[PDB]
Design a protein around this nucleic acid. Structure first.
Ligand SMILES: [Mg+2]
Ligand SMILES: [Mg+2]
Ligand SMILES: [Mg+2]
Length: 179
RNA sequence: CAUUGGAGAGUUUGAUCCUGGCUCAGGACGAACGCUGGCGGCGUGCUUAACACAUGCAAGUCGAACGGAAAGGCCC
């Protein structure tokens, strides 16, 4: 539909009571637009559909923009929440999302189409997802880098990156008109 | 004054997170084995006993260095 989502992982958690165990289901969802806004939602329920829906509606209110320099990451980053380290590097067009399941789902929902992502540290899906999330949040878009440094993009950033951004904008124009 | 390049999964708990080993998906081979087997092209083929070897062959050539004449060859 309008917003593209992947179910990263589901788990069957339980609570022990005098009678026995009270099982429950946890859901990781990643919901994105495919063009730069993406979020992750955690859902608790007694049932898989309810947990998934709760996670999705909780993720809707956690959409953060991701800077894409033409279908790829702006610059290499390394994120880490708790113990989930995720390394991201931009890749040439056509490389694809070379990433592990959870991080790959996060990137595909964010709309990145050429990226190299490695999962260092723990392999727990939730923590790896948070590490991919803050790795993406660490991304620093070239115009705001120029604002930070009090300079211009032509003075701070690589000419190849800027050029590739122009050609990507031109294919954007193409699609738009074509429509 | 950009890059040609990096994927995980299972398993400790009632459940969780971490640590952590174990196991697996890939590629490879001077390989062997099992089942099966049409052809062609190009390679490769004792990794162990530097263990012991029947048989044939694998280093000869020169008469324009020499005496020669055992064969073939010409002349009697
Ligand atoms: Mg650490
Ligand atoms: Mg224990
Ligand atoms: Mg168990």
């Amino acid at each position: 539909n309008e917003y593209l989502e992947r179910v990263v992982a589901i788990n069957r958690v339980a609570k022990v009571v005098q009678g026995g165990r009270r099982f429950s289901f946890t859901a990781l969802v990643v919901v994105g637009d495919g063009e730069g806004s993406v979020g992750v939602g955690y859902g608790k329920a007694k049932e898989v559909p309810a947990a998934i829906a709760k996670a999705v509606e909780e993720a809707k209110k956690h959409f953060f923009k991701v800077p894409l320099v033409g279908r790829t990451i702006t610059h290499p980053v390394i994120g880490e929440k708790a113990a989930g380290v995720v390394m991201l590097r931009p890749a040439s067009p056509g490389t694809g999302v070379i990433a592990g399941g959870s991080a790959r789902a996060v990137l595909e929902c964010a709309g990145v189409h050429d990226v190299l992502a490695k999962s260092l540290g723990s392999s727990n899906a939730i923590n790896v997802v948070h590490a991919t999330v803050d790795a993406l949040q660490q991304l620093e878009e070239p115009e705001e880098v120029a604002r930070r440094r009090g300079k211009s993009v032509e003075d701070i950033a690589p000419a190849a990156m800027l050029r590739a951004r122009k050609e990507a904008d031109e294919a954007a124009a193409a699609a738009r008109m074509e429509e």
